[PDB]
Symmetry: D2
Subunit: 208 residues, 4 copies
């Protein structure tokens, strides 16, 4: 197993996945009037692991307990995304939907905080025009919160983009089009999900 | 440029193709009653390049005129397929349609000859029962014979499998499901087609 | 093989086997300055996609097994005509052309059984346009179990490089202390299972499957 | 390139660049028996995904350019804390773990501008759990008369191997006659274009992008 080798059958092997490009998505929307579309945030439009990594190293060195620590979220939602790297795949998707005049919504599962600068970070990085921009929506199971599925129905989103399985299942529970984005290999959120596990479309080269 | 090297973006780059597996196609047909389906022959179910390679070397060493030589066709359709290698992807597909009780048809652009043993070779290599088997259909512009499209319609084929672009557009012109098979890299019929150039489904690992 | 929608991920997409890939140009470059030498090539799945004949052979003599490989009648047909159905490999044309320019002596060592007559040498010389000056009649080493018949020939002709798709081709070169370079066996070949190219740390030529 | 449905073919799907890939296990095996030695690692995109800091730095001091790489205020931040946001690479952990078991002396060489203080050494020692006997303070190489070049440091510490993602990391190892090994730079790194790994015939570690 020091020199495993390979063969051409293995080199050409393809996973039965429905791949698509931004251009093909645009083409499929030809003629449709403006609509509402939504994006997950982490690993979908932003490589935000730097902040999650510092948070982990600061509150739960050997675990993920920091995800439930209020002190982590106050900092994550109010500045640490200044270290989050915007994804090129998202930049192209957002420009494309803005050209169409569609309404752009960002739905996140991050713990809601009193204040947040995530909305500002998104609008500046992706040059979203005021007419298409909407404040970040924090979905959750809390009583004062609405779940992700309710927010997709409420805003009448017709397309939802995300890297996680719950992003795709949410779209399917609403009967809308859920499109998978690939999570970068160096994300700290492991293991990487299996893109295409629901027979959904997956955007090519969307890891960066 | 002795050492062009590479980078991780190139390594993971994917063409926006809609890949599918035999299992997925099967699952997509659950509940449907037996129907009529068709297969292109060359490079779809049989690797027949051996016969054509010898044909050219025997009849047109410097051109593709052997394709017009009726002496070549007498040989190709009456024995040279004994050297043709059955494709495993076809084997899986044919066994699947048989289990369903579907009616299998083979359509070829090969020149028609008085006799032909291709039908026998096909029924024998894939163990096609008499109930599902049908004599090979030869098509073309000869006013004495029907074109590929016309044959697909006349037999009401719902699915057509092929490695070439005309196999897909033919299905498209008929409003049926056209599924692409990959042409082996060592086939003498070049250049290789761009599987997926029409947004059609392409079967994985179907080159052998 | 039991999951309807297995999906994938980017780490899996970019995953590489630790193999030493080389191109023909790189091989040629590593030979600059070297004087004409003797080099060898295995035949089946290295220089010729010959499965068509072995396929007709099995169907004709051993539909249920591999006894045809020991049948003298099979070898008569295979070595005297069936390679007319064998398809030359492009990767091989490039190597052979490269060695002809260098002025090297080209040898073909096969494990096929020796027969009274053989037209394989002629097929090779014609399909690859090998000059008489560099051509040598094919050496049929045969195939004796628990022993590698090729070693003897690589030593006697003092071959400095041996090209092959099978493990025994590479180990043969290793036994002689010479440079064994691997060629990929096509996926549609009937000789299965496919070998693990790079399993001895040897150089593997890119895109050599056709 | 602009075609909507480009499609593909099996020759393109199986196409391989002629590159010499190696695994960490192969590297370790090639060191078997050899006594402790000095080894060096480049920092950015080799052991740490540090783009987060450079991204924030550019956004803060040079929104419309690369001038921040010349601003002292940027380096102060970068070398004294912003690496808390740097993500350590797995390929690096495996390599450092292996050299630690061997007992080798580990050096980190960076082209980052030097500042009066720096917490980078501390970040690395902690992140990769390097024992005090194998750890050495980060070396800031450069042009300034108060410092030495990357080449000079590799020689001065007598490093036998040097790991890096950039072309100048590999040519530095070549100039010193030592073994230079390439690490793949992550696709989401902000330092672009990505370099052509294996452009010098060097060994390239597989799956080293994360
Ligand atoms: N260990 C982790 N490292 C990085 N990001 C994480 C980790 N665990 C969870 N996350 C992210 O935190 C987000 C919280 O809300 P979401 O469910 O929208 O999606 C989650 C992930 O994007
Ligand atoms: N050079 C060639 N090598 C192999 N097969 C060929 C070559 N030229 C034509 N063919 C095949 O001959 C077939 C004739 O009918 P089709 O058009 O269905 O498809 C054609 C190809 O599959
Ligand atoms: N089942 C098979 N299908 C195709 N070729 C085969 C098969 N079994 C053996 N061979 C070939 O027969 C050759 C005999 O000599 P070699 O060992 O040089 O290489 C062997 C293979 O190339
Ligand atoms: N735009 C950038 N994004 C990320 N890192 C960068 C960028 N420009 C320069 N660098 C890094 O800054 C480092 C300075 O020293 P090095 O030459 O060792 O390596 C350089 C790169 O790793
Ligand atoms: Mg996400
Ligand atoms: Mg065909
Ligand atoms: Mg062989
Ligand atoms: Mg670097």
């Amino acid at each position: 197993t020091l020199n495993p080798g390979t063969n051409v059958a293995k080199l050409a092997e393809q996973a039965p996945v429905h791949w698509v490009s931004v251009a093909q998505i645009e083409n499929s929307l030809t003629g449709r009037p403006p609509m509402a579309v939504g994006f997950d945030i982490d690993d979908t439009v932003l490589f935000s692991s730097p902040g999650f990594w510092r948070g982990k190293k600061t509150y739960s060195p050997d675990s993920d307990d920091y995800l439930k620590n209020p002190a982590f979220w106050e900092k994550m939602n109010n500045g640490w995304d200044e270290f989050s790297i915007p994804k090129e795949a998202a930049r192209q998707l957002i420009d494309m939907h803005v050209r169409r005049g569609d309404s752009i919504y960002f739905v996140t599962g991050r713990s809601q905080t009193k204040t947040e600068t995530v909305s500002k970070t998104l609008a500046d990085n992706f040059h979203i025009p005021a007419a298409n921009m909407n404040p970040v929506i924090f979905a959750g199971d809390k009583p004062e919160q609405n779940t992700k599925v309710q927010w997709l129905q409420e805003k009448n989103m017709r397309i939802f983009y995300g890297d996680s399985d719950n992003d795709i299942t949410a779209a399917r529970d609403c009967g809308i089009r859920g499109i998978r984005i690939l999570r970068a290999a160096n994300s700290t959120y492991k293991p990487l999900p299996q893109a295409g596990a629901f027979g959904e479309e997956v955007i090519v080269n969307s890891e960066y």
